[PDB]
């Protein structure tokens, strides 16, 4: 499936502004902005890393550098419920506790049914046997960007559109 | 050892079956307003009415918010109390009507009791037992899970469900960890290794929780106090799920949203169902909206709408204005900045200014709550300054007087200290006088 | 839930000939207004025509919102009554026309008929097969009665409902097929070798007899706005509670209009029109009125009741004054009900009904004093004095509000006119319009 | 330490004695003896830490030393005390309310002090081995850590093993592991292995191998404001909002919970409360809603001492339609004590100009300083302060090391003050665009 | 060939070593005192010692304030940062105006980084990993026309290579310092393995495999503030599609700015970085709000604030955001205490004629002597900018009739076809229906 709208882009822009070569400084400035002058770098800003590690209770001081240098959707996906130390300022406020208490709690419990309002409205209103009344008129894929005569752009577009993770 | 413009007041000062006397509970004077607030406190403790608005008005430096904090102290910390100013209602993420509705629901509490059968302790053994006839094509067909929990003054082995082994191996429970088992849900939850296993590795991450007290199996009667707004917030956003939208919302900014009437109605009906069941009970509280003349006509109209609701708390308003224009209008002159349709819906309490002796007694009480020693002649001079310029100016000058006394290494404030502090720190009238006489911008 | 301002009103108090009784169902007097509201109620319950604007105009503290609450209480269940204020339209995430469209479509209910099947029996055997990550779940359920025995096939949602409120092969359950709801009715087999994990204090019920699968027909009412929000996006059910439905496109609305018309043609669903009540309707911009003038002419429009207390006041958003704060285009297509002020007798029995609603016992002289102070001042102040005088009477340990409790409540708590006189006699102590105040007493 | 010569960088604290008596010219501050004594009283109020929520108004004419007095108070306060200096227009936000910006500025100025013990084992690993057991449920390891002087072997638990698998260690990179806390960090590869891999990569850096004792003990004191705790507990990963400012209207329930937990930690002994100053420069540029919230938020127990500066006369309060003294309503001025700043004379202007010349490394003659003092008496003080630093550049352009009278005269001719510019505008008003948008572009008719 | 747009004859202030302005130098005609004042300001910027130094240059419209600001920016060179700004640009709908003013403040403070670019490129002739399922080191042998080179590699570069699906024979690009891997394509030696193939084929590079280069990185403090305060997170080097969540501008806190200043000072103390303070030029300052004017007072007293240059063509005008504050140049008096005012004078007939001749020379136009005085008379009669903007229609009307000279008839024709503001307003007043 391809969009009928094609954005034809010259090879000069992609090979002189996005891709790194010998005559530009894409990689050098990218490293200089993301690693060398990052304020979460433990090699140069260890005091701030220790301060934030006391604040959040994260047992790794490199986690603030890893969080700030990853995409938000990727950070959503890779995140696992790691343990945090007790000696920290990031404690648990009360409704987070209740929500995390009412997980696999059964029915005829007060605190489970008090937090299952949407489930009771779903089951009471017979909402899982209702019929869909609206569909969109037109469905379209994203606009295909083509750079004629370049194979790197096809691999990059296929990696962005069909990212395996 | 921290004092800030208050906390010398401890309740109203009302004796039972009677009226308020002069100096009780940190209050001096204001007998009628204290008696009216005591009647309102009894009305809140009666736990029957809904949407009773009280407005108390007067001049500045009269003690309206002192009366509101006395109401909050007299009710106790168990009854909800939401102090608010009219400037909080103007938010940039959500409309002011939703902010007023949220602050209305924040002042209605719920007292929920629960019974929990809890197994807890250090794991002594963990043997997933096989069946007598295992089925082919699998490995370790578990018939039951035997765990051994040890605690203070007792230990007990358990025979658990076979499905708890996947929760144990998913939550990474090992031998010697302290776990937390509740009865009807399964749901293993380790808290950490015991403190008896803390000196076998030089370097390790996890904290070593102590060995838990009491028996391994116990019934604890817990009491949970949550407001209705907590239930609306916990029911608006869903439970912690396994979809990208929920974790995106958890990782992003918690933007406020317009909570629908359907969610509040469903929360109200399930709360009423569990009140009728005899488990939970309702404690209405006070929403104290201070400087109520800063509200405009739309929030006043929605206050008229929401004061007739079924689950509204009492609303306590304060305003120091007189016949003043209501904000949001250009030609509506109303008392206290409050429009007459809202004024019809509330009972007005009057607060009166003080004479010289009451100002002196308030200055003496604020000195004795700040751990300061004032001379009698210095007290008389401070009372004359307070009755000449402002009560708040004389109250705020006590700490510079104490520091100027401490500089000369004495523990008492004298008239030279108050003269030096008067010369150093000006008041509003003298500052306006030097503003008028000086033409140098 | 608690005792509110209109909690004493359950209906309009009208007979079979739509004639108002002088005191019935908590509503006293206002016979022209109550007969007109009964005409509105019968016209809504008839449901033949749509989009009629009704205006309830009168002075403050008269019984306009009381009349609307009586109409809503006489409406009964399963009819959508939307009661909004004037200030709720102004939103930072919705436009005014979109908020008015949502308020309009919250008042049109769709009564959908559903054909379900009820399965109640004793669980014999449960086989649940899941993947290693627990994603794909399937299995078989063996459930029996005293006569029959059937092996069903489970899906993901069925297994999810099974592992919640967990059934242990001998508990009698009830499964609603269309709603997907499991209610564990109790435990029947009472197994001797129970695991010592859960609090096994389940109720003992018998195994049900007869048909395992019984067909049933159920009826539920879903408003048009809920269908719009559900079909708007893939997480519309959560947006029904968070209100995060930002400016639903018109294509969804017209396709859902066509689908609702098709459901009415098929006989699956029927349309239940309701009432949209806009309290304090003068607090709306002229943009809202110009949208309302065309929203009333649609077929899917409820009977709109508006209440306002303003005289010839300035219309919001403009620079001219109009009757009731509404432009003459809206007043042309509106039907106005006029409410009138009360005399001494009606005020007295209104206070008596409010006293018996609050479980407050008044003496006759205290009721006469309350009637006199509700004639001199407004009605709402004397109504609010009742609970204060009740608390004063319970402070002196007698369960009867005497005259002196009302006198003490009058002395302690002020009305509008006394506070106005106290402000105007002491204008130096209060901050005026120019911001000038005299904090000093000397 | 990225500071150039600022507007008031010469001021290092209020020049007071031990009896709170101001010296005539010390610590960069000249004159203003009553204002400096009152600022010393306010500084002692802050340092006592037992009086909270007091509003102080520093009022005076422009170019007098109100913000100079605030800078002196901030410099005399020292480190680890939260000082938040904001302008009056900083709270008119688009993603926050004025009340939310006010309370975020309020909670940035009061903090808690946390002392913790660090048993840091910082070194380069020699080799680490992965003992993949047959069961696989538990992993044990031996960590060969080294410095430039000694090298020890450490037994390693399984949580160490899968915490070193993450942020992976490749036998020669500098790490640092706490003993009691168990924190792990990877500082980077050593300089000994710099020529081992022929190309660095993206997520790597080269650090020196640490020297001396392998196991170090250090007590580090953390000063955390309440706003930091609010932003951290407002989300799941809150430090990104702490450094990007995307907090977004934190709800009051977590603020009440944080206040209760802070009081619990203060009573328990885990931390102590360090109050500070919130300085609102140019406080007249606030709405009346912000003023009422300022009045009613000063009575909280966890409130700092608010210092306010303004230079307005009887001016209109913003958001209203009436004038007021200092641009502030009378209820706000009721709960305040006003420090007034008086105008200068010739000697104090001369001393301030001399101190500003010494702070900029500019050498002036005696008659050049007399001319600059006469200019600062006729015109304002800041005009002569700028004339010093441009006459310095004229002197270096003239191949001279000292600033003479002729350099100051040339700087006076080249750069105009307010009065000369307003006279030259009023003489040729037809050549400028006036308030009605009319202008005469053409020079001839 | 070359494009001239109301400037580009301004090559600089045209001063000597003593800071004295000649009459005609650097494309500047007249305006001696303001040019000497701007030269003093340029020397003050080049001293790199003072912070927050604010000047405002004021005068009538079309008198050369922006010309003086561009001459300052030309005299400082391209190394020193210069942020040109209009006063209307501070009003943003995404973030508040004070944050935009602070962003433009920190855009005018730059850094100089000496960095080394090292590039390995060529055809891959050997790709052998070495494990211990974890790769330990990677042996890669590149090949160019001048020879081969065999390199060890850490497993991160193999992670990038496996991202790039690099096989044997693919001409690739490797940066040594940053680890950036780019696959150019396959070589021509493997261009005949199939008759038709999806792969692209690049020739063998004629240069050496190992290339070293010294380059200069010119960044600003605002660039580091933006790169350290991405609200959603970082992004890869190659990303043709944006993130699914829209990243908007946020109010960057003072803590991030303090940490960035600390890191920059630490890099400066090692000699890696050099601090170059620059110029923030806000043009048409008179439409700044009183909020922005008030925040400018606080921002000018910062320790890292740049040299701020303001321009205004107003007289006795009300400050925007107020109702009765009448102040000179539209700038409030508490701010005007903090600047030095440089007066910009109008021109006479001879200066206008010389400016017209200079602009005609810089636009490659030959103007007759008789037409030049008529253009000067039209400049003195209507406006200088009207006479400057009429040179291009004069040139095209001359080229239409096959000529390379501006005759007086062509100037009369261009005056007849195109009208100034005065004759347009004269038509506007003496007309009935909307012009
Ligand atoms: N009757 C009283 N007895 C003791 N202290 C009082 C009394 N009335 C007022 N105060 C003190 O005066 C201070 C200011 O009063 P406040 O509540 O601000 O009055 P208002 O709200 O009318 O301005 C309070 O801190 C309170 O402690
Ligand atoms: N006829 C009535 N029956 C019952 N209660 C009434 C009646 N008339 C007035 N009331 C009481 O007086 C008040 C009427 O004011 P409201 O409901 O705001 O309507 P309106 O704004 O038209 O006066 C209500 O609180 C209601 O309890
Ligand atoms: N007492 C003083 N001692 C030293 N410098 C001063 C003093 N008063 C003012 N200054 C200097 O004068 C300059 C302008 O004064 P400033 O404090 O900005 O006035 P204002 O407080 O009215 O804004 C500042 O750079 C400040 O350093
Ligand atoms: N001394 C000068 N020499 C040459 N050209 C000049 C001179 N002064 C002004 N100009 C020209 O006149 C025009 C004035 O426009 P500009 O400087 O942008 O506006 P303003 O003068 O109102 O600030 C510029 O295009 C500039 O090229």
Residue numbers in the entry:
A (entry chain Q): 1077 to 1241
B (entry chain V): 22 to 462
C (entry chain W): 18 to 459
D (entry chain U): 16 to 460
E (entry chain T): 21 to 152, 161 to 463
The authors write:
However, amongst these remodelers, the INO80 chromatin remodeler appears largely sufficient to generate the well positioned +1 and −1 nucleosomes.
However, the density corresponding to the HSA around the Ino80 motor domain that was observed with the Arp8 module in WT INO80 is no longer detectable. This is likely because, without the Arp8 module, the HSA region is either poorly structured or highly dynamic. Deletion of the Arp8 module resulted in only a moderate decrease (~2-fold) in sliding of S.c 0/80 nucleosomes. As a result, in the absence of the Arp8 module, INO80 remodeled both 0/40 and 0/80 nucleosomes rapidly and with comparable kinetics, and the sliding activity of INO80 was not dependent on flanking DNA length.
